Structure formats: C-alpha cells, structure tokens
Design an enzyme around this catalytic site. Sequence first.
Site, short mmCIF file in Angstrom:
data_model
loop_
_atom_site.label_atom_id
_atom_site.label_comp_id
_atom_site.label_asym_id
_atom_site.label_seq_id
_atom_site.Cartn_x
_atom_site.Cartn_y
_atom_site.Cartn_z
N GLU B 14 0.78 -1.28 0.08
CA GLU B 14 0.02 -0.03 0.03
C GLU B 14 0.60 1.25 -0.09
OE1 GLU B 14 -3.10 -2.45 -0.35
OE2 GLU B 14 -3.11 -0.17 -0.61
N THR B 19 2.23 1.62 -7.92
CA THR B 19 1.76 2.56 -8.69
C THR B 19 3.15 3.47 -9.42
OG1 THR B 19 -0.19 2.94 -7.24
CG2 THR B 19 0.77 4.65 -8.63
N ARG B 149 -5.87 -2.00 -9.46
CA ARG B 149 -4.98 -2.94 -8.33
C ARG B 149 -5.06 -4.38 -8.87
NH1 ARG B 149 -5.24 -3.22 -4.07
NH2 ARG B 149 -4.81 -1.92 -2.30
N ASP B 171 10.37 -4.78 -8.35
CA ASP B 171 9.33 -4.68 -7.42
C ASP B 171 8.75 -5.87 -7.10
OD1 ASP B 171 7.39 -3.74 -5.61
OD2 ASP B 171 5.96 -3.55 -7.02
N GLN B 175 4.68 -11.50 -2.63
CA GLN B 175 5.20 -12.74 -3.23
C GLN B 175 6.40 -13.13 -2.15
OE1 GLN B 175 5.04 -15.46 -4.16
NE2 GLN B 175 5.45 -15.65 -6.39
#
Lengths: 35, 320
Positions: B14, B19, B149, B171, B175
């Site tokens: 978050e 983004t 998302r 990124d 995971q």
Amino acid sequence: DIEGLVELLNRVQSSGAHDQRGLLRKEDLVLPEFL
Amino acid sequence: GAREVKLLLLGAGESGKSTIVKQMKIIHEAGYSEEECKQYKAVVYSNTIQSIIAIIRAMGRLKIDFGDSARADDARQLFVLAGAAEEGFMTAELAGVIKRLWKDSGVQACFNRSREYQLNDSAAYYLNDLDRIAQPNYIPTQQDVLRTRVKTTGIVETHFTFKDLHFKMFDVGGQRSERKKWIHCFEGVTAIIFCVALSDYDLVLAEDEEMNRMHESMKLFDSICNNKWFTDTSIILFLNKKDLFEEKIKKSPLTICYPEYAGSNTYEEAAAYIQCQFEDLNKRKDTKEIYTHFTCATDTKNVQFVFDAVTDVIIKNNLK
Ligand SMILES: Nc1nc2c(ncn2[C@@H]2O[C@H](COP(=O)(O)OP(=O)(O)O)[C@@H](O)[C@H]2O)c(=O)[nH]1
Ligand SMILES: [Cs+]
Ligand SMILES: [Cs+]
Ligand SMILES: [Cs+]
Ligand SMILES: [Cs+]
Ligand SMILES: [Cs+]
Ligand SMILES: [Cs+]
Ligand SMILES: [Cs+]
Ligand SMILES: [Mg+2]
C-alpha cells in the site's frame, strides 16, 4: 538475515490492506456475518 | 557507454510501489492505449465492488448501522449481484445498489473511520465516479487505469530508457521471496527507492503488531539504510501519499503515531517531523546521504518531476 523476515513482514502483511485486489473471486463474496 | 541502472522498489504494501512502476510506463514508455484501457474495465469494476464491500464488512465488525435500514437489502443484494455479473460489465441494477450504499450516512460514517480497518486508497476515487464508471459506454481513462489494483505474481518490472540509461525497475511485494531471490534482487542494485505511506500514521494497530505501520516501516528503512552492502547504492526515500496525509492531519493528530510529538498539526510541521524520524535512522550522516522526496505516486506530473531528480542523483552519484 532477519532482514529477509522484516521485508516479508512489511511488504506482505500489509498487502492484506487489499484483499481488494485483482478480479472478483468467490472468496471476496462470502456474505458478512451480520448477514 | 550505456549503463544498466538497476532500481529496486521497497516498502510496505500500500506504500505505492506498484503505482510508481505504472507511472514509469506512462512517462518513460508508451503508456496505455485505448485498446488497452478498455482492457481494464473488468478490474476497475472488480475494484469498485471490493471497496464498497470492504466498507460493508467493516460496518459489521465495528457495529456501525446504516443511516437507513433499507440498505441492508442492498448490501445483501450487493453480494448476489456481484457474484453474478459477467466481468467487464456493470448493470444499472448494481450501479444503483452501490450508489445507494455509498450515499448512506451509516456507510459514510464507517468510511470516515477507515483508520480502524484496512481500506485501499482507491475506494474513494472510484466510488465517487460511479456516474461515469457505471455508464455502459465507459472507457477507463489513464488515471482510471493508474488507480487499478492487480496481481503481483512473482516480481514486477519495467524496462525504460531515460537520459540514455537502461533502467530496470524491480518490485516484489507479497510474493514471499526467499533469501535466494532477495540476495539476487539486492545484488546489482544501483538505487533503492523506499516508499512510505505517510497517510498510514493514523492506522490503528492490528491484533498482531507490537508497533504501528509507520514504525514497522521505519525499522525496515533503518536496516536497508545502514547496511554496508548498500553503501554505494543510492538510497532514495519517497514519503508518498502526501495528499491523503494533508487531508488527514487535519482531523487526526500525529501524536497517534508519535506520542512524543509536540509540534503543531500542520501538514508542514508533521511532515517535517516524519522526514526527520526516517532520516535520523541514518548512522552515517557523513558517510551516506538520503534522497527524500514527498510525493503522490498517483500524480503523473509530480512523479515525472520527482523521478527526474532521482535520475540526476543516479547520473552523478556514479561519480561522473
Ligand atoms: N490517493 C493516493 N493514492 C495513492 C498514492 N500512492 C499510491 N496510492 C494508492 O494506494 C495503493 C498502493 O498501491 P500500489 O498499488 O501503489 O501497491 P503497493 O506497492 O503495495 O503499496 C493503491 O490503491 C494506489 O492507487 C498517493 O499518493 N495518493
Ligand atoms: Cs523513452
Ligand atoms: Cs498513451
Ligand atoms: Cs437506522
Ligand atoms: Cs477515509
Ligand atoms: Cs466525481
Ligand atoms: Cs514487464
Ligand atoms: Cs519496455
Ligand atoms: Mg502489494
């Protein structure tokens, strides 16, 4: 090191802040208990 | 000669990592074409629904009742309609149910207490645009796609050339990557861009956490920062979500997150305080420098600008 732990705990445990991700799946549809 | 610039994105979920990646494609790549935006309708709706549901679920746990008891039928109907609407399309029926629920004072009341639960920061963005989004002739815009998302299956990445450099942005995120992957991700890093969600300062702590989101993020930063292995690695710090922060700081004091804080409750002083909490973690203020930028991941303009500066630091931290 525990470094691997911390990264997996901060960047993962909060990805939960989004069970709200991806396309709609049966799991995210279970009607809330206060039915 | 051409240099490979390996950029690694780190930071709590978050925080805005995913983004920033998309911003790179919009800025330093092709971006999203119409044929490709249309492709996101399914997710845009999926996300919109997941948001109103996250809030509906929250009302239960927190025991917040609907301003109007009729909404209970809508809510129950929300789950049926949802689990029955072919992905990509939204009926005049579902749009109505959502519009009525989002309009309910009970639901808005719960929305305002999003700090007590975990509501993604796209819910507002989409629930307000229901007029547009709901219409069947709807075509997701770039900003619409930017707010989506999706799935982080494995490790996300983008290749792009900027100032004649071969940028490779990595990124992970969720995971579970083992010491294997991790060591392999760190090896070759030119710069670590650490993202922090400023707006997370007011989040109520979970039943499992000893410290709050901010301090958990602070802890991780501390390590990344003072780790000799990343010495020659450019450490950029992105204090993201400043828009939400500014909106929040108004109603919720920073003392929620830093009880010792004694400054005023202005975006300015609170923000300056957080910039210090992270930068003071640095054990070698002489040896290493922290490149901090207050940003808004979802703002293409600001990101372009901020990433423009990061590159200068990279372009020359390479002692040249
Ligand atoms: N309003 C707002 N939302 C943001 C900002 N940065 C990221 N977000 C949103 O917050 C969430 C973080 O998502 P990303 O998808 O960036 O995932 P992350 O890498 O796990 O933190 C997404 O819902 C983004 O659209 C920001 O500056 N402002
Ligand atoms: Cs380019
Ligand atoms: Cs485009
Ligand atoms: Cs009521
Ligand atoms: Cs909110
Ligand atoms: Cs609007
Ligand atoms: Cs890719
Ligand atoms: Cs590319
Ligand atoms: Mg994530």
